[PDB]
Design a binder for this molecule. Structure first.
Ligand SMILES: NC(=O)N[C@@H](CC(=O)O)C(=O)O
Ligand SMILES: NC(=O)N[C@@H](CC(=O)O)C(=O)O
Ligand SMILES: NC(=O)N[C@@H](CC(=O)O)C(=O)O
Ligand SMILES: NC(=O)N[C@@H](CC(=O)O)C(=O)O
Ligand SMILES: [Zn+2]
Ligand SMILES: [Zn+2]
Lengths: 153, 310, 310, 153, 310, 310
C-alpha cells in the first residue's frame, strides 16, 4: 500500500484495466466498443511485450468500470485477455472474458437480405460454442453462421 | 386472458407445444361454431409489402369472418411506401397508431420481428418474411393433418421435392418434432436434400427418419404425403426436367396407399401433382388451403380477444 | 344540422375559424368516446387517382372506425380509368351515383373542386390535388398543436426546410393566421424561402415573423417545431447536401428547448430528423400522424351526419 | 543527454511524437490515418492536460517518421498540434501542421451523385482557405464545399 | 506531336487559351478541307452510358467523317453493363484494351476523369458527366461565335434563361473569360440566376457584367444572344409559365438587333425560341449544332494524330 | 483454303486439336502483324438476340480491326423481331441473304446450330446459346494460357467457384483435356461442384485431378488460377455469403504463388477478386479479355478468307 511509480507501463489510479490483448485487437476494441467516447482519462499501449510470447495490446480507462456482460463481450476478440479492476490505487477486482449467450450492436449480419441493414435497429446474435467454431444466430433473419463468416465483413 | 392474447406471432419456433395445441383447438371450434362478431369493432391492417394473393385473400377472409374491418395494401409498386428512403420502422410506427393489429408479408427476413419493436402493444402477425417463418402456413398444415389423421403423433410423414429451399417443410418438420413417435421419409434429389441441421435436430430427439429416391418405396406406409413446390430456377432447365422424374405424383402411384393417407401441397401446384390425382380420396390440398381460414381465424381470435370460449 | 353537414371540403381557405373550431372539437370528442356505428349503413368511395398509402390507410381507417363501408382504388395504372379519353367529370358523374361520399386524391390542381360540380348532393373531400389544399392534413396538424399546446393562439411557431414548395406549411401558416398573437420563425435556405405572398398576408394582419439561418437561434423560445420535407429534386445533389446543413434535426439541438415544445413533420421523414430524436419527449410526428384518424373521422362525421353530439 | 524518466507521460526512445491534440481528435487520427496498422510500438494518451487549457490527446509511434505532407494532413483536424520528432532518445526535429493543397484518402464527397462512391478510387480534394471557412473541391465531380459540410458525413 | 496528342479531354477548365485556339484553328481547317482518311485504321468507342441521341450522332458522325471505325452503345436497358456490382473502372479497364479512344457520356459527375485512371494511354473524351464539364459542347459554341463574330474578344454576350442549372452557360462564360474585354448580360428569373461563384470569377478578372430582367434592355447592343433551356422541373408548373414571360424569344424582339447578332441555343429548344425566329438572319442554333461536327472532328484529330497540318 | 474456311463455329467440342492450334497460331500472327484490310468489302451481322455488351463490343471491334463492315442488333425491346410467331429459322433465312457471316448470341440452347440449317453457305459463329458452347470464349482463354505459360500441356490448372453452372469452365476443361499431362485442381462448394460427367471424361483419359476446399492448398503449384463467377441466384443469400468464404481471392493468398502463375476470370468480376489483386503481376483477367480480339479476329479470318499467311 505505497507510492512507488514505474515507467514502461503507466499505472495511474482508479480505473479498469484490459491487459493481454492479441495483436491488432486493441484498436478494434476501441472502435467497436466506443471506449474513447468519454472525458475520463485513457492510457493505451500497443505492441507492448508481456509474459506470454510475442506482442500484445494494453488499454486502461481511468474512473470507469465494466460490468460482467461487457467483459464477456470481449471473449470473441480477446479470449486470453485479463481485466483487472483498480481502486485504492491497486487491484480490487479481476476477471476473464467468458463467451456470452448474446452479442449486440457490434457484429454485422452476413445475410444481405436481412432487414437489420437499412433499418434503425441494433444487430443481435445468439451464441453457441462447438468444434473449431462459434455459431452466431441472427435475431432478425434467424439465419445461422460461423463467427469466421461474420467477422469477415 | 388466454396465453396468446396480445402476443406477436412471428416465428413458428417461438410457439410451445401448448401454444400449438391451443391454436389448433380454437380452429376446430370456430370451424364447428362460427363467431361472426367476435372482432366486430376491430380494424386490422393487411400489409403485403410483397404480393401473395392466395395468402392475402385467406387472411383477409379470416378477418371478415370474425366481423373485423380491414385496411391495407399489396405493395408491388402499387403504393407510395416503396419510396426507398422511408424505413420499415417508420412505416410501422405510423400504421400502428391506426390499427388494432398488423398482418404483414415482406420480401426480407426479419421484417415482422423488427415491426414488433416499432408497433406498440399492437400485435404483428407474420404472413411471411421471405425465407423465414411462415407461421400460419405451418399451423394450417398441422391443423389439416390433425383433422384427417386424428392426431399429430406416431405418424408416418413423407415430404417430397425441394426440401432444401422449402421453408414450409423445414417449418412443418420442426413443428411435428414437438410431438412423439413420428416417422419421417425424405424424398428428394441430392441437389435439394433436407438440410443437415434439420437431420441433426431429428437426431437430438431420437426421431426416426430415412432418405428415399422415390415415393414408390414408402407409399404403402405413409399417412401424410406432403408434396413440395420445385421452382425451375433453383436448377438448370435440363437438370430440372431430368430429375423431375418420379418427384411428381400421378394417380398410378397411389394404388397401394393407405386408406387414411392424405396428399398435401402448399398450393402453388403444377409440374408436381397430376390432375388425375384431384379425384382420388387422397387429394387434400384444396381442403388444406381451405383450413387456412380457421387456423388464421383462430390466431386472430386468440390475439385480439382476451377469453374465447367454445 | 351542423354547419358542415353535406358540405364539400376542398380548400382549407374555405373554412372559417368557427368551422376549424367545430372540426377540432368533434375530433377530441370522437377520440375520447369512439362511435363505431355512426356511419353504419354508409358507403364511401376512396378514390386515389394518385397513390398515397399513408394518407389512404388513414382516411379509410377513419371510415371503418365510424362503421362506414369503403370502395375505391389507388390508381397508378392499376385500374382502367386511366384511359385518357374519359374525363374526370364523367368519372365523378358515375361514382357519385354509387356512393354517399367521395374522398379523392389527384395529381392535378382543382380536381376536387371540379368533382364538386359533377357529384350531386354527394359531398367530396379533397385528400389532395397535387400542389393545392390538403385540408385534412392541416386539420390534423392544427389538432395536434392544440392538443399538445392546449391552444392555437399566442404560440411561437418555427417551420424548417423547404418552405417554398411545402404546401402543408403554406396551409398551416394561413390557418394559424386565423388565430391571434402567434409568432412565426422561418428557417430555410434562400433558394426555398417562404413565398412573399405568405409574408404579405402575415403583414396585413400585423402578425410577427422573422427569418433565421438555423434552428439554434430560436430553439429556446419555440413551442412548435414544424419540420418540412426537402426533396432532392428541387435542387442539385451538390446543392442539397451542401445546404442540408443544420436544416436537419438531431437530439443535440434540443438541449435548451422548452419542456412543452413539440416537433412535428408531415410523415415522409429521412434526411431531416435523426432517429436519436425519436426517444426524446419532444418527438411527436408519429403522434401527429396518429391524430389524422380523429381529424378525418370528425370531418366525415360532420359531413355525413346531421347532428352529432359529444 | 541522460537517463532519468517520468510516469505521467511515456518518454521511450526513437519515434515520432504527436503532442497537443484537441479532445476527440486523437482516436480519429488513429482511425483516419491507419496509424495502429503496424508492428512498431505505440503509446497513446487521451484526455491528458498540457500547456494550454482544454483536455487534449497524445500519440507516439516508436521507430516511424512522418513526412512533411503527412504532418500537414493533420491541419484540418489538429490545427494546433505539435509534432516533435525523436531519436538519440531526444528531440531531433519539430514542426507544426500547415494546411495542405491536397487531402486524399480520408474525406468523403458530400455529392451523392459523385462517381467516387461506388468505385475503387481514392477520394481527393483541393484546398483553399478563406474567411471563417475552408473550401474543398472534389477531384472527380469538381463540386466545391465547405469543410464543415464535408466533415459532417 | 501537337500539344493535345494522346491527351484526355475531360474538363473545359483544363484547357489553356492556347489549347482552345489550337482546337478552334483545326476545326476551321477541317471544315475548309475535309480529310476522310485521317483516322482510317482507328477504332473508337462511343460509350453512352446515358442516352443522348443528338450528341451521340454528332460525335459518331465526326468519327466517320475522319474515316475512323465505331463501336459502342447507349446504355438504358440496351445493354448488360448496368448489371450492378461491375464498376465503371472494370468496364473501362476492358473496353480500353479494345479501342484506340473512348468517347463517353455518363449520368454521374467525374465519370470520365475516373475512366482516365483505368484506360491506359487510351485517351478518353468526355462527352459529358451529367452536370459537369461538357467540353466539346463549349468548344462548338466558341467555334460558332468566332466564326460568326470573327473573334472571341470584345464582344457583348447575353445569356438568357436558366443560368443557375444551365451547365452549358457556366462553361461558356468561363471559356469566354479567358479572352479579353468581353461584356456580359445575364437575363434570368431570380430563382435561376447566374451562380455567385461565376460572378466572383468575373470580378477577379475585372470583366464587365450586369443583370437585366428582359432581353429588350440589351438587344440593341448584343453580339451573341445565348438562349438557354428551361426545364419545368426546376420549378412549379405555375412558377414556370408565370415567369416564362419574356424569357422566350419571338421575332418581334429582334427589331433593333445589330446586323451581326447571332442567336444560339444548346439544341433542345421549345418554349424558348418561337419558330418565327427560324426565318430571320439572326437564328443560328441549327448552324451552331452543325459546328459540333468540326469542333469534335478537330478534337479527335489532335488527340489521335501526332502532327496534323492544314 | 484453310481447314476452317466457310465452316460454322458452333461448339468447342466440334474442333479438333489441329483446329485449336490453327486458330491459336493465327491469333498470335494477327496480334504481331495487324491486317486492317483483310475483310475489307465484307459485311458481317452481329445478331445479339440476347444482350451481352462486353462480348458484342469485343466481336464487333474484331470485325472492324479487319476492315469488315458491321450491321446488327442487341434484341431486348430494341428491335421488332421478338414479335412472336416469326421463327428463328425465318429470321436467319432472311438475314443470311444480306450478309457474308452471322455472329449470334441467343438465350436458347442450340440456336446457332439451328441457324446453320437456314443460313446457306453463309457461316454462323456462335457467340453463345445461353449455357451451351461459347466457342470464342474458350479460344480466348486457351490463347491467354498459351501466351502466358508458353504451352497448353503439362500445366497445373485450378478452377474456383461455381463449377456446376460455370459453362466457361466446362468448355475450358474439355479443351485442355485435348492436350497432354495437365493436372487439374477443382475448388468449390459441394453444392456447386464440377459435374460428374466432366470427371468421367477426365478419368477416361487418365488425366489427373483432385478436389480441394480452398485455394491455399494448391496455390504453391498452380500455373493458372481460373476464377469463376458466382451468381447469388444459384443459392440463398445466406447460403452464398456463408460459403463465399475463401472462394474469393485477395492479394494475401498470393504470397507463395509461382512467379509465372496467372489469374484469369470470365470478365464479370466482383465478390470474387478483390481489387488489391489488380496491382500484382499475377492478375491477368483484363489482359485475358484483351485477347478476345485476336482470338475472334483469327476465327473471322480463317472463316471468311481462303488462305491467310503470317
Ligand atoms: N407469393 C407467394 O408466396 N404465393 C403466391 C403464389 C405464387 O408464387 O405465384 C400466392 O398467390 O399465394
Ligand atoms: N404520395 C404522398 O403524398 N405521400 C406518400 C409518401 C411518399 O411520397 O412516398 C405516402 O405514403 O403517404
Ligand atoms: N440527354 C441529352 O443530354 N440530350 C438530348 C436532348 C434531350 O434531353 O431531349 C439529345 O438528344 O441530344
Ligand atoms: N450477359 C453476358 O453474357 N455478359 C455480360 C456481363 C453481365 O452479365 O453483366 C457482358 O457485358 O458481357
Ligand atoms: Zn440477419
Ligand atoms: Zn465528388
Amino acid at each position: 500500500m505505497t507510492h512507488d511509480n514505474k515507467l514502461q507501463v503507466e499505472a495511474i489510479k482508479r480505473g479498469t484495466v484490459i491487459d493481454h490483448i492479441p495483436a491488432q485487437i486493441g484498436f478494434k476494441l476501441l472502435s467497436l466498443f466506443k471506449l474513447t467516447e468519454t472525458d475520463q482519462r485513457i492510457t493505451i499501449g500497443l505492441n507492448l511485450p508481456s509474459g506470454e510470447m510475442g506482442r500484445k495490446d494494453l488499454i486502461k480507462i481511468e474512473n470507469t468500470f465494466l460490468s460482467e456482460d461487457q467483459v464477456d463481450q470481449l471473449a470473441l476478440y480477446a479470449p486470453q485477455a485479463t481485466v483487472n479492476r483498480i481502486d485504492n490505487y491497486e487491484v480490487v477486482g479481476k476477471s476473464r472474458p467468458s463467451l456470452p449467450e448474446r452479442i449486440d450492436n457490434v457484429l454485422v449480419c452476413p445475410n444481405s437480405n436481412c432487414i437489420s441493414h437499412a433499418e434503425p435497429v441494433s444487430s443481435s446474435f445468439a451464441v453457441r460454442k462447438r468444434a473449431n467454431d462459434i455459431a452466431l444466430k441472427c435475431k432478425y433473419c434467424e439465419k445461422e453462421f460461423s463467427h469466421n463468416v461474420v467477422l469477415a465483413n | 386472458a388466454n396465453p396468446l392474447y396480445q402476443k406477436h406471432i412471428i416465428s413458428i419456433n417461438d410457439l410451445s407445444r401448448d401454444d400449438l395445441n391451443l391454436v389448433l383447438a380454437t380452429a376446430a371450434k370456430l370451424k364447428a361454431n362460427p363467431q361472426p362478431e367476435l372482432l366486430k369493432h376491430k380494424v386490422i391492417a393487411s400489409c403485403f409489402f410483397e404480393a401473395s394473393t392466395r395468402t392475402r385473400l385467406s387472411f383477409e377472409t379470416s378477418m371478415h369472418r370474425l366481423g373485423a374491418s380491414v385496411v391495407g395494401f399489396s405493395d408491388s409498386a402499387n403504393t407510395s411506401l416503396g419510396k426507398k428512403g422511408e424505413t420499415l420502422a417508420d412505416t410501422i410506427s405510423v400504421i400502428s397508431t391506426y390499427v388494432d393489429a398488423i398482418v404483414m408479408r415482406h420480401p426480407q427476413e426479419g421484417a415482422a420481428r423488427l415491426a414488433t419493436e416499432f408497433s406498440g402493444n399492437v400485435p404483428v402477425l407474420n404472413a411471411g418474411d421471405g425465407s423465414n417463418q411462415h407461421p400460419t402456413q405451418t399451423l394450417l398444415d398441422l391443423f389439416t393433418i390433425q383433422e384427417t389423421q386424428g392426431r399429430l403423433d406416431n405418424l408416418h410423414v413423407a415430404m417430397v421435392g425441394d426440401l432444401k429451399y422449402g421453408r414450409t417443410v423445414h417449418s412443418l418438420t420442426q413443428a411435428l418434432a414437438k410431438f412423439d413417435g413420428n416417422r419421417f421419409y425424405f424424398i428428394a434429389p441430392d441437389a435439394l436434400a433436407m438440410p443437415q441441421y434439420i437431420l441433426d435436430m431429428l437426431d437430438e430427439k431420437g426421431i426416426a427418419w430415412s432418405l428415399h429416391s422415390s415415393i414408390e418405396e414408402v407409399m404403402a406406409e405413409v399417412d401424410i404425403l406432403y408434396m413440395t413446390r420445385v421452382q425451375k430456377e433453383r436448377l438448370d432447365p435440363s437438370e430440372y426436367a431430368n430429375v423431375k422424374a418420379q418427384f411428381v405424383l400421378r394417380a398410378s402411384d397411389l394404388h397401394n396407399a393407405k386408406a387414411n393417407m392424405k396428399v398435401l401441397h402448399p398450393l402453388p401446384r403444377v409440374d408436381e401433382i397430376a390432375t388425375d390425382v384431384d379425384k382420388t380420396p387422397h387429394a387434400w390440398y384444396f381442403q388444406q388451403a381451405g383450413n387456412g381460414i380457421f387456423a388464421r381465424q383462430a390466431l386472430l381470435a386468440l390475439v385480439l380477444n382476451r377469453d374465447l370460449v367454445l
